[PDB]
Subunit: 175 residues, 2 copies
């Protein structure tokens, strides 16, 4: 089920890609190299070989946006300032897209008075009501965003501003 | 003099390449990943950025065949069993090809009674006489070979077996 030969990596100009059969992971350079986009047809549990990995030196596991357990390359292309490993990201979604943009109908604000890192949350409630104001303590903008066919999700650092409730849609995987 | 945007790296299947405008460095996989071919239109002194480098983790400087000072990627694709860093290689030749094959009219023998590593030598003397018998202490076959338009050279590990005259054409660069 895990074939290394399928895994490809290429970098040219301002664009880098770590890809395989079901994975597409794009890193770009503005000021500095950082994670830009990711597309998952199916989330896989294979480990990414450093032989097939760009910039695999001095990688901190905690900063790897995509966990190595889910096939995240051990790479600084798998980085993003203000964000850490998304172990609690919505990896249960199967088909999933990771990028940095605003979820529709939401706003994100950098505030040290915000809640700490927690399991990733969906921007809509169980009712379908859109949570408007979100925040993060030390993260950067545009915010870390997941997109499934069910709805829109935010990274672990992005928490709701007015929300303290025992009801919330939250991802279901811990890593 | 050093533009990073030119530099490319790609890996697919059994083949990996670190390249730029004048550099082409190919690594292949049989059993294990190791340096296969290299072509230099002109040797450049630029340092290779780890962002553009494949497999840049845990790299031992001594095992890098192409010195980082001459733009050898800090990578395990830049490795080759039985050979170490070619600091004293003929990098002055301008147009240059590094591969693993036998220089025409020569034989290479693995022998512990051989001379130790030294500056890279040309297979012809100043007379044009072809030095026939070569050896190495611990190197592997096929032997490390450089090709310029002037002649053919062997890796630092490969020394002449019996040649008393220092009329040797020899690289005098130190790194």
């Amino acid at each position: 089920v895990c074939d290394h030969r399928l895994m490809s990596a290429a970098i040219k100009d301002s664009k880098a890609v770590h890809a395989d059969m079901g994975y597409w992971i794009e890193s770009e350079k503005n000021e500095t190299w950082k994670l830009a986009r990711a597309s998952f047809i199916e989330v896989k549990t294979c480990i990414w070989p450093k032989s097939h990995t760009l910039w695999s030196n001095g990688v901190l596991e905690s900063e790897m946006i995509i966990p190595k357990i889910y096939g995240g390359p051990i790479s600084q292309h798998n980085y993003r300032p203000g964000y850490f490993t998304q172990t609690a990201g919505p990896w249960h979604l199967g088909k999933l897209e990771l990028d940095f943009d605003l979820c529709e109908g939401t706003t994100v604000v950098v505030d040290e008075h915000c809640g700490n890192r927690g399991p990733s949350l969906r921007t809509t409630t169980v009712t379908g009501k859109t949570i408007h104001e979100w925040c993060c303590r030390s993260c950067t903008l545009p915010p870390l965003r997941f997109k499934g066919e069910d709805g829109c999700w935010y990274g672990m650092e992005i928490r709701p501003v007015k929300e303290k409730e025992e009801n919330l849609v939250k991802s279901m995987v811990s890593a």
